[PDB]
Swiss-Prot record:
Recorded superkingdom: Bacteria
Stated name of the protein: Nitrate/nitrite sensor protein NarX
Job of this protein: Acts as a sensor for nitrate/nitrite and transduces signal of nitrate availability to the NarL protein and of both nitrate/nitrite to the NarP protein. NarX probably activates NarL and NarP by phosphorylation in the presence of nitrate. NarX also plays a negative role in controlling NarL activity, probably through dephosphorylation in the absence of nitrate.
Organism classification: Bacteria, Pseudomonadati, Pseudomonadota, Gammaproteobacteria, Enterobacterales
Organism whose genome encodes this protein: Escherichia coli (strain K12)
Subcellular location: Cell inner membrane
Periplasmic side: 1-104
Region of the whole protein represented: 42 to 145 of 598
């Protein structure tokens, strides 16, 4: 029953690579950040995390997005160090997907 939640996680992976490719960010990238925020706090991602006992892991990714990843992407002048932060966020999404019940 996790299919949709996994689609949302895949979307977050794509959106983080998209924002990294836009570094250094400017006014025109604000819509990307907004879209990513709406996806990260999606009601379904939350309900799925709840039924599969992953709520803490989901809240952790949300906290990292707001307190570490976006701040670093806003500050970056080049992709040099923030690239590794994007990689860690994607690794975290892969772990979240692993924990969902993916059975028929």
């Amino acid at each position: 029953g996790s299919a949709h939640a996994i689609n949302k996680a895949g979307s977050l992976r794509m959106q983080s690579y998209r924002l990294l490719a836009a570094v250094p960010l400017s006014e025109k990238d604000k819509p990307l950040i907004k879209e990513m925020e709406q996806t990260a706090f999606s009601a379904e991602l939350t309900r799925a995390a709840e039924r599969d006992g992953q709520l803490a892991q989901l809240q952790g990714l949300q906290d990292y997005w707001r307190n570490e990843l976006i701040p670093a992407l806003m500050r970056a002048q080049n992709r040099e160090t923030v690239s590794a932060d994007v990689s860690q966020f994607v690794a975290g999404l892969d772990q979240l997907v692993s924990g969902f019940d993916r059975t028929t």
